[model samples]
Target: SMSVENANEVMKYYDTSLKILKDLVNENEIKAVLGYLDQKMPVDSLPVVSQPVVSVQDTVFVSNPGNYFSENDRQNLKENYGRLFRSISAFYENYKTYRLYMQDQSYKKDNNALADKIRKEELLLSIALSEYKQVIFDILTPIVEGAKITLTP
Candidate 1:
């Protein structure tokens, strides 16, 4: 078993990493996909507004970070943080599928132009992404920050 102090410190690191990951996950990953759906130039992509724990600027799931987390704490981080990663991933996946569907309809014999439909898609995308951000900030982040577990040091 790890000491109380070790667990506390590890949890601190764990929570900090989670927060950073979520920020980049929404800001970079989703925003990039939104741009792709919008057919915008790569030059206009938004800046990632957080310290990335996984080093790379844009990614969906950061499987490993090569940190000093113990097997126990690793499991802890995986089960808790990994769950959120999956949820975020699933949300993005649905958005990607929607983009593909919209593309299919772009050339179809319909009165609504792709440009017209995509404008509404942008509004919905903004709402969904902002909701995730709201969840990250309002619901999960506080609980993560105040965690008090102690473990491997």
Candidate 2:
């Protein structure tokens, strides 16, 4: 049986990891950013095309819809993305350390339960991060120009 000392150590590590994760993954802030984007999107003001007369007057009135993307809003998006970037990096780094910790603990104590829990937790973390990544992309698509966001993690 794994001793109380070993078990406590693992529990403490897991708890600390969770705290770090919670601080980094600012879901509420991300939601606010998304709402801001939704409200600011200039979907109805798109420039008209296929005009019969190629008059300079018609072309002069054609406005770029992206002008709706204000400088302040762009900065806000960058801040949100930076937060997410840090969260993703921290999650991957912490997960690697967590796996290694569990591996050594399992070997030393011959405990498969902890090992099993580790696998399950890893899957859950991966899924949660992926979901967050998708939401971030949804927010970025309308505002980001020619910028590619990849979810390799």
CA RMSD, predictions in order = 8.3, 27.1
Per residue, candidate 1 scores C-alpha lDDT tens digits across 1-153 of 435544455455546666565564555555655566553533234233222244443232223422344465445444545555555554455455545545566435655464456556555755564554444344334433444422312
Q: Candidate 1 — which pairs collide?
A: 6-151, 7-150, 7-151, 8-150
Question: Residue 85 of candidate 1: its Cα lDDT?
Answer: 52
TM-score of every candidate: 0.37, 0.33
Candidate 2's residue-wise lDDT over 30-102, tens digit each?
A: 3332332232334333222210223333222221112233565445434544544454554445444444544
| Model 1 segments more than 4 A misplaced | 1-20, 39-106, 113-119, 140-153
Predicted structure with the largest TM-score when compared to the true one: 1
**lDDT for every model?**
0.48, 0.40
